[PDB]
Design an enzyme around this catalytic site. Structure first.
Site, PDB file in Angstrom:
ATOM      1  N   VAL A   7      -0.384 -21.360  28.196  1.00  0.00           N
ATOM      2  CA  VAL A   7      -0.535 -22.482  27.266  1.00  0.00           C
ATOM      3  C   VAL A   7      -1.176 -23.641  28.022  1.00  0.00           C
ATOM      4  O   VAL A   7      -0.731 -23.972  29.121  1.00  0.00           O
ATOM      5  CB  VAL A   7       0.829 -22.912  26.664  1.00  0.00           C
ATOM      6  CG1 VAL A   7       0.644 -23.993  25.599  1.00  0.00           C
ATOM      7  CG2 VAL A   7       1.598 -21.721  26.102  1.00  0.00           C
ATOM      8  N   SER A  10     -15.969 -17.291  22.001  1.00  0.00           N
ATOM      9  CA  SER A  10     -16.048 -18.715  21.685  1.00  0.00           C
ATOM     10  C   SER A  10     -14.777 -19.498  22.050  1.00  0.00           C
ATOM     11  O   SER A  10     -14.899 -20.642  22.481  1.00  0.00           O
ATOM     12  CB  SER A  10     -16.432 -18.922  20.224  1.00  0.00           C
ATOM     13  OG  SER A  10     -15.614 -18.149  19.364  1.00  0.00           O
ATOM     14  N   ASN A  66     -13.164 -19.094  24.724  1.00  0.00           N
ATOM     15  CA  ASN A  66     -13.322 -19.275  26.170  1.00  0.00           C
ATOM     16  C   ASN A  66     -14.587 -20.066  26.566  1.00  0.00           C
ATOM     17  O   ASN A  66     -14.930 -20.093  27.749  1.00  0.00           O
ATOM     18  CB  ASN A  66     -13.279 -17.908  26.884  1.00  0.00           C
ATOM     19  CG  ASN A  66     -11.896 -17.318  26.928  1.00  0.00           C
ATOM     20  OD1 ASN A  66     -10.896 -17.995  26.680  1.00  0.00           O
ATOM     21  ND2 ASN A  66     -11.800 -16.033  27.234  1.00  0.00           N
ATOM     22  N   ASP A 115     -14.072 -11.415  29.313  1.00  0.00           N
ATOM     23  CA  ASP A 115     -13.485 -11.983  28.095  1.00  0.00           C
ATOM     24  C   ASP A 115     -14.356 -13.128  27.559  1.00  0.00           C
ATOM     25  O   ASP A 115     -13.869 -14.214  27.258  1.00  0.00           O
ATOM     26  CB  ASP A 115     -12.016 -12.405  28.338  1.00  0.00           C
ATOM     27  CG  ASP A 115     -11.153 -12.477  27.085  1.00  0.00           C
ATOM     28  OD1 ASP A 115     -11.583 -11.942  26.022  1.00  0.00           O
ATOM     29  OD2 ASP A 115     -10.036 -13.036  27.170  1.00  0.00           O
TER      30      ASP A 115
END
Ligand code: 4S3
EC number: 2.7.11.1
Length: 289
Positions: A37, A148, A150, A145
């Site tokens: 998070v 968008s 990231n 990975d």
């Protein structure tokens, strides 16, 4: 390059004890999913993003060490900047330069009332993101990975590639632990192959999200997967003009078709037929120019 070692209790204190509450009510949470998070914080006279990591506890520590390794070797204006980390406390923390405009996914969906991105801004973001992937491939790193969520946006909407926890050095391999986001993955990446050609495919999906403003996957849509529009357009049932994001006033058909052509080439199902990142970068530069 070496990073500052932050105290967990300093990071806990500046993020209001890692508040789950969002931006409006008075908390610090900025988004999750990327194996942790991200919380807003203010440390050593600067606004920062503190990623508290949160499968196995050992695999999460492997990705923590990988992120620092990749960031220590890779500094570029189109990659997020790591300012430091924390291993001392209960949860593993990574500290970055704060990205005031969140992710490209958030901005394409106009999350929290933000205005739609203009075609002019979208072109700069596509070029910036391609420059960041080029830098990673030049330094023999495979992101694994690209999506968008990231691609983060700074104070000037400059594209910053993030999340190097799953990144792999090359410097075609096979793996038993298939990782990434299904809706963006190349067929070979979904089968366990590890290659920079899979990052090109995932970037082709990002380019379609930029043109259309549509998410890579939508449960309440037909086709549910955005990559299927490449076939609806090729088997001339539709055209890319039928899919252009209606939330733009400055998109011209010529540059949209030039970006779509790059995306189509990126999305070739045979990995060896796709262009390399230098060619993608060249084509995106010629589109503006
Ligand atoms: O600095 C940041 N600010 C914001 N904003 C600020 C404006 O209000 C909204 C939230 N969102 C972020 N990421 C999340 C990611 C998930 C989807 N939504 C955005 C980051 C970072 N996120 C990361 C993630 C990894 C590495 C560095 C960073 S910096």
């Amino acid at each position: 390059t070496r990073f500052h070692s932050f105290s967990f209790y300093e990071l806990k204190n500046v993020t209001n004890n890692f508040d789950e509450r969002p931006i409006s009510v008075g908390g610090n949470k900025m988004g999750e999913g990327g194996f942790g998070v991200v919380y807003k914080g203010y440390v050593n006279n600067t606004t920062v993003a503190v990623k508290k990591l949160a499968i196995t506890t050992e695999e999460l520590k492997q990705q923590f060490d990988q992120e620092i390794k990749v960031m220590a070797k890779c500094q570029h204006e189109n990659l997020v900047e790591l300012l430091g980390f924390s291993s001392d406390g209960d949860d593993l923390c990574l500290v970055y330069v704060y990205m005031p405009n969140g992710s490209l996914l958030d901005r394409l969906s106009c999350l929290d009332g933000t205005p739609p991105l203009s075609w002019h801004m979208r072109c700069k973001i596509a070029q910036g993101a391609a420059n960041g992937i080029n830098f990673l491939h030049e330094n023999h790193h495979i992101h694994r990975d690209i999506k968008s969520a990231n691609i983060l946006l700074d104070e000037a909407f400059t594209a910053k590639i993030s999340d190097f926890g799953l990144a792999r050095a090359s410097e075609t391999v096979m793996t038993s632990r298939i990782v990434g986001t299904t809706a963006y993955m190349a067929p070979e990446a979904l089968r366990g192959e590890i290659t920079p050609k899979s990052d090109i495919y995932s970037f082709g999906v990002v380019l379609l999200e930029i043109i259309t403003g549509l998410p890579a996957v939508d449960e309440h849509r037909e086709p549910q997967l955005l990559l299927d529009i490449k076939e609806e357009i090729e088997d001339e049932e539709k055209t890319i003009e039928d899919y252009i994001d209606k939330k733009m006033n400055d998109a011209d058909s010529t540059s949209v078709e030039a970006m779509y052509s790059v995306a189509s080439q990126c999305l070739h199902e045979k990995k060896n037929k796709r262009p390399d990142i230098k060619k993608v970068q060249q084509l995106l530069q010629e589109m503006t120019a």
